[PDB]
UniProtKB/Swiss-Prot annotation, chain A:
Full protein name: Transitional endoplasmic reticulum ATPase
Gene Ontology biological process: aggresome assembly; ATP metabolic process; autophagosome maturation; autophagy; cellular response to arsenite ion; cellular response to heat; cellular response to misfolded protein; cytoplasm protein quality control
Effect of K231Q: Impairs ERAD degradation of HMGCR and does not inhibit interaction with RHBDD1
Enzyme class: hydrolase
Phosphothreonine modification, residue list: T416
CDD domains reported for this sequence: RecA-like_CDC48_r1-like (cd19519), RecA-like_CDC48_r2-like (cd19528)
NCBIfam families found in the cross-reference section: CDC48 (TIGR01243)
Modified residues (Phosphoserine): S17, S442, S682, S730
Residues the entry annotates as binding ATP 2: G501, C502, G503, K504, T505, L506
Protein source organism: Homo sapiens (Human)
Mutation effect (L178W): In IBMPFD1; increased ATPase activity; impaired autophagic function
Gene3D superfamilies, A to Z: 1.10.8.60, 2.40.40.20, 3.10.330.10, 6.10.20.150, P-loop containing nucleotide triphosphate hydrolases
Residues binding ATP 1: P227, G228, T229, G230, K231, T232, L233, N328, H364
Alphabetized UniProt keyword annotations: Acetylation, Amyotrophic lateral sclerosis, ATP-binding, Autophagy, Charcot-Marie-Tooth disease, Cytoplasm, Disease variant, DNA damage, DNA repair, Endoplasmic reticulum, Hydrolase, Isopeptide bond, Lipid-binding, Methylation, Neurodegeneration, Neuropathy, Nucleotide-binding, Nucleus, Phosphoprotein, Transport, Ubl conjugation, Ubl conjugation pathway
Length: 734, 473
């Protein structure tokens, strides 16, 4: 069936002139590590690039970014024919011109800013009629090749005459703008897009498939999440990547119409969407249209709500239209829209995690010239509660700060700014510190569902639990059939217990880092908040957000916090059960046995934990966590000093064999006070500084142990009571 | 529903007028109202005159049925209390039918309807899928089969890609769906179906609990007789017992017995868990108790089972706690709906507890929970059937002796035996995984698991229950 016909998929290398394939597929096509290929596609267009082996790629798929993809006039899911083109020689005269919708404001030497550093010993092969995009001057400028001397295609040589008429040409109809929103413009939604795309892949790319089969395609996709990530941009990108029609329904836009024109817009929106199948109608603010519950005062409001409900049932299925919508919270929409028949499918798109935040920062720095001293990952770390919007504006103040340092002190009264100035313009790392020192990075702090960036190397020793942990999370998800064979059901959760400062939280995170799953940190105060305000109804909400993030590790840090407030020690005459803990047990048992969410509960007071939680079918396994041993405190001291300027004569193992009754918390406190004394020396002497050994020796003159011998021996007695044996025997017949 | 509420004020009543009038001419006929809750929620969402006017319009049309004209009006909703109680008046919507989620047997029937067109393989056991779909409705099974078909599709012609307005039949006819394809659909986020109180018939017989022939006939005298011989009760004049309380050590099959007896009667079963009772207690919502009995009554014959009844009393300290009373608002409301319930119905109540020494004696009074039945740890013969039941879904070998463990374990409970089997499976599965980087659960697995076996029921706990049972007689 010809192995030269491959399916176009997303790229990994975001460079323009490069296509990626799998090495075994390259062994079939007899290709080499950097041969000039020739890509033919729909509507008779060719594009010349370079082949590079991508190990993460499949055999049937080929990787290429949007720039090349649009030149071939193909969408993701199309088949293109690739053949080697080694008859490409160096070029002489190349006629090239920019497009008017990308130079609409800037002028000057576009070559010095865009062209020259793009072919500076790059030898990029370009064919006549191609459109390549160069990002510079804090924007995006496209160029279309007019004519090359070795027509049609040639390789750009360092001795190639680059003709530039200086005339912004127009864009054609079939020439889709690269300036639009695609899948290469959104981040922090890795798990989300995968679910979304696989829901809209087939029914939008092959309408004949679902009409010739009994499979029922989705009609409604709801997007949760706080206003920031860009739910608007997601649906828009899908319509511009799959090629479907895009008609957005802005909430307030429709509600601002007269008493009757509101229906007119919706009736017309669906009509002009149904007529242009495949189409995607994206209701922007859905909550602004149908919040039918208590804020349903007036017949006019419900007259709009019940109208949209019928417009959903009005989807004749034969026509291909998918209704996407955005909201701040799933419970802001009329339950009649929650009906599994209208908006049946739902995708929770919460705040970006640590990994996701950097993914977004990369998108908002692709246009601007960043300096070498800048590390974008650093900024992505100290932003515990940021969304896509706030991360976008974070660069805005930081970039303009760098602008308020250059020509700002020179000042040129022009209606257009030179490009040479914008090319020599850079942004320091200190400018981002100023953006963080400002009150702008403060964003809305919600439940952080992250993929822990903490590894096991931070937690030295204790291999006995690592093996036991993986049997409870690694095994049942990577070996599903193995659980099916022996017919056993996975324990839904595990309770940790022992002295505080021994990495209970650090374990539950690391075990998620191993499985590469999601993690939810429900700290103590987040458990007492529901107890004081009597809002234990939010317990179910957690499990749901945990469910809609599978695989996930639901982690109740300091579970005894509620028992503590009731007294725990002395306490009132009341039982061991409180309202919040009770509701946790409700959702736990009320969860499907073969779901995914694992419920790890951490406590340092196991003697006051409700025994009903530790029943078989809830938190069965009891995992004790002792203080770090001699072979544990070694790697732990490496961890807390991993990002600190270590010296030579600082024997770390000497501290490990010296320390004994010290917890991981006690080890870090030593390091904290060690750095303060180091900075103390530096600052005062400046009126060269690297932390030395005597900074640690001076830190052991006032160091103390957190856990006491009475506490340790107390936990040992708790373990000796649990795990043991009667053992057996003692049998009688009658 | 929303179709009518979408039409402007005036055309609303017009559509209702035209609906009944034109349908009446085509008698016999059935007028079906879809989302009725969107029409008559006359309570707090009745903000405005138009809505009330619409409800009254429908109310008048309901009364307008001349009887001689033969039309019958049906309707649907999410729950009974969504509709305006004025429509509940016996003369309009007099007959009520509860259509909850399907059970194991129910979903199997549905699966056959959705898979009647697709080619199911030999390894495919649709009945198995029906058993592990804990809380799925009819619609969810449709999307389940659909998403599973796509898994089987995106591996075949997907690589070929036939861009046409009509796919060839010969290629598709050869296509078949495997058991793993159904697995992948369950793995997705689409089986997230609504989960409510599941009312079904227990698929567990007496054979899952060894011996105890005395309590079999005991339970049968309490539920089997007043349903299979109601004429005999009228002959002797006695009135059937209204409920029984199970007391004894945890993990002795109190829940399984309550299900097993329901299985013998082929009646419905309702499991009201402890946390569910406390949820009403902490939330100060003892009103929901009433809703349960009505839901149980609409499934007669049925067994209403309250697992861990003492859970409320446990919250109030149990041993000492407060100085105040023995009764609370939640337990009290259960008593109310119990006495109110007709004696000659078919709903039976069973209360399980591991702490009978703290249960309010008011519930044990005649005409409520009359009978007091003690459930001890499983005997020699009992442990045999329990181990076989717990290993019914496990690749046990034939060289493995089960009665041997029944002679091994004495002061053990049903929960303890199950715990042992599961601990053996962890070692069994760990072996299979380690081998790859062949596996059937064998003898040495159990014998190695027995080292981590415990006897949860202490001797002193046994003596207390014997002591308590002594006082009763």
């Amino acid at each position: 069936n010809r192995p030269n016909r491959l399916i176009v998929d997303e790229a990994i290398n975001e460079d323009n002139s490069v296509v990626s394939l799998s090495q075994p597929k390259m062994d079939e096509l007899q290709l080499f590590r950097g041969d000039t290929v020739l890509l033919k596609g729909k509507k008779r267009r060719e594009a010349v690039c370079i082949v590079l082996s991508d190990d993460t790629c499949s055999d049937e798929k080929i990787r290429m970014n949007r720039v090349v993809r649009n030149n071939l006039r193909v969408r993701l899911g199309d088949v293109i024919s690739i053949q080697p083109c080694p008859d490409v020689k160096y070029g002489k005269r190349i006629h090239v011109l920019p497009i008017d919708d990308t130079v609409e404001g800037i002028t000057g030497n576009l070559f010095e800013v865009y062209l020259k550093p793009y072919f500076l010993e790059a030898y990029r092969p370009i064919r006549k009629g191609d459109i390549f995009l160069v990002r510079g001057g804090m924007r995006a400028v496209e160029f279309k090749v007019v004519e090359t001397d070795p027509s049609p295609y040639c390789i750009v040589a360092p001795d190639t005459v680059i003709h530039c008429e200086g005339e912004p040409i127009k864009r054609e109809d079939e020439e889709e703008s690269l300036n639009e929103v695609g899948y290469d413009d959104i981040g922090g939604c890795r798990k989300q897009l995968a679910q979304i795309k696989e829901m809209v892949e087939l029914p939008l790319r092959h309408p004949a498939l679902f009409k010739a089969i009994g499979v029922k395609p989705p009609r409604g996709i709801l997007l949760y999440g706080p206003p920031g990530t860009g739910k608007t941009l997601i649906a828009r990108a899908v319509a511009n990547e799959t090629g479907a029609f895009f008609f957005l329904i802005n909430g307030p836009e429709i509600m601002s119409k007269l008493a009757g024109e509101s229906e007119s817009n919706l009736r017309k929106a669906f009509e002009e969407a149904e007529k242009n199948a495949p189409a995607i109608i994206f209701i922007d603010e859905l909550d602004a249209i149908a919040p039918k519950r208590e804020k349903t005062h007036g017949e006019v409001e419900r007259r709009i709500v019940s109208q949209l409900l019928t417009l959903m049932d009005g989807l004749k299925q034969r026509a291909h239209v998918i209704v996407m919508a955005a909201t701040n919270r799933p419970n802001s929409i009329d339950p009649a829209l929650r009906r599994f028949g209208r908006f049946d499918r739902e995708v929770d798109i919460g705040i970006p995690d640590a990994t996701g935040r950097l993914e977004i920062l990369q998108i908002h720095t692709k246009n601007m010239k960043l300096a070498d001293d800048v590390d974008l990952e650093q900024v992505a770390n100290e932003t515990h509660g940021h969304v896509g919007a706030d991360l976008a504006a974070l660069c805005s103040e930081a970039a303009l700060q760098a602008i308020r340092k250059k020509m700002d002190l020179i000042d040129l009264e022009d209606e257009t700014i030179d490009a040479e100035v914008m090319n020599s313009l850079a942004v320091t790392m200190d400018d981002f510190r100023w953006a963080l020192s400002q009150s702008n990075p403060s964003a809305l702090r919600e439940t952080v569902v992250e993929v822990p960036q903490v590894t096991w190397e931070d937690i030295g020793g204790l291999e006995d639990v690592k093996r036991e942990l993986q049997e409870l999370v690694q095994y049942p998800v990577e070996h599903p059939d193995k659980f099916l064979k022996f017919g056993m059901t996975p324990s839904k959760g595990v309770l940790f217990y022992g002295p505080p400062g021994c990495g209970k939280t650090l374990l539950a995170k690391a075990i998620a880092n191993e499985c590469q799953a999601n993690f939810i940190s429900i700290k103590g105060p987040e458990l007492l908040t529901m107890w004081f305000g009597e809002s234990e109804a939010n317990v179910r909400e957690i499990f749901d957000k945990a469910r809609q993030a599978a695989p996930c590790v639901l982690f109740f840090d300091e579970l005894d916090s509620i028992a503590k407030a009731r007294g725990g020690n002395i306490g009132d005459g009341g039982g061991a059960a409180d309202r919040v803990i009770n509701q946790i047990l409700t959702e736990m048992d009320g969860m499907s046995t073969k779901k995914n969410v694992f419920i790890i509960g951490a406590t340092n007071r196991p003697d006051i934990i409700d025994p009903a939680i530790l029943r078989p079918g809830r938190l069965d396994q009891l995992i004790y966590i002792p203080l770090p041993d001699e072979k544990s405190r070694v790697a732990i001291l490496k961890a807390n000093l991993r990002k600190s300027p270590v010296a030579k004569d600082v024997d770390l193992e000497f501290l490990a064999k010296m320390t004994n009754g010290f917890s991981g918390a006690d080890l870090t406190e030593i390091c904290q006070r060690a750095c303060k004394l180091a900075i103390r020396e530096s600052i005062e002497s400046e009126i060269v500084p690297e932390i030395r050994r005597d900074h640690f020796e001076e830190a052991m003159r006032f160091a103390r142990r957190s856990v006491s011998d009475d506490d340790i021996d107390k936990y040992e007695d708790f373990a000796d009571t649990l795990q043991q044996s009667r053992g057996f025997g003692s049998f009688r017949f009658p």
